Amino acid sequence: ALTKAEMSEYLFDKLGLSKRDAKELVELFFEEIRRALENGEQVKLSGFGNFDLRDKNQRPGRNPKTGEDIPITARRVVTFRPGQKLKSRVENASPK
DNA sequence: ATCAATATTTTGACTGATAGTGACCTGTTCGTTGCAACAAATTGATAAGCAATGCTTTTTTAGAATTCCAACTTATTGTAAAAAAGCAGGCTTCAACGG
Secondary structure (H helix, E strand, C coil), X not given: CCCHHHHHHHHHCCCCCCHHHXXXXXXXXXXXXXXXXXXXXXXXXXXXXXXXXXXXXXXXXXXXXXXXXXCECCEEEEEEXXXXXXXXXXXXXXXX
């Protein structure tokens, strides 16, 4: 699984950047994105996807184990709509 | 031409920088490690994305024009002694107007 460790190492052998800043950029990368989502801003990354924010209302739910119907509290989640470019590169993938 | 005193002739004390290694402190990097975070697994009513593909709107894109940055290659131009006037910063007196 791709981790921040592998991402930093990549920037070291592709951009020749020290692992230090290579590890600091990967952190600030996801950080800045999370700061935009929490602030209520859409994140549109061309050639990748789009992190949307939809306010879901309180809908009926339950306890998957027993079956006790419990109303799922409303909350703002963070969806991800992959671009057409990304889909065309993952359409022919393979779980490995 | 020889006394006699002061600047002269090498050494030593004075005071903090010069010299080069070493300890001090801890960012920074790497190995050991703990733990919040992530993933599998349920069950079932309700919400969101989905197949194709040309036209329209929004965002990223590769130059290319433009102008300061820059190491070179040209294009023109060229004065000083020797006098002897020409101006203002402030203290100095005569000459005209008013009591």
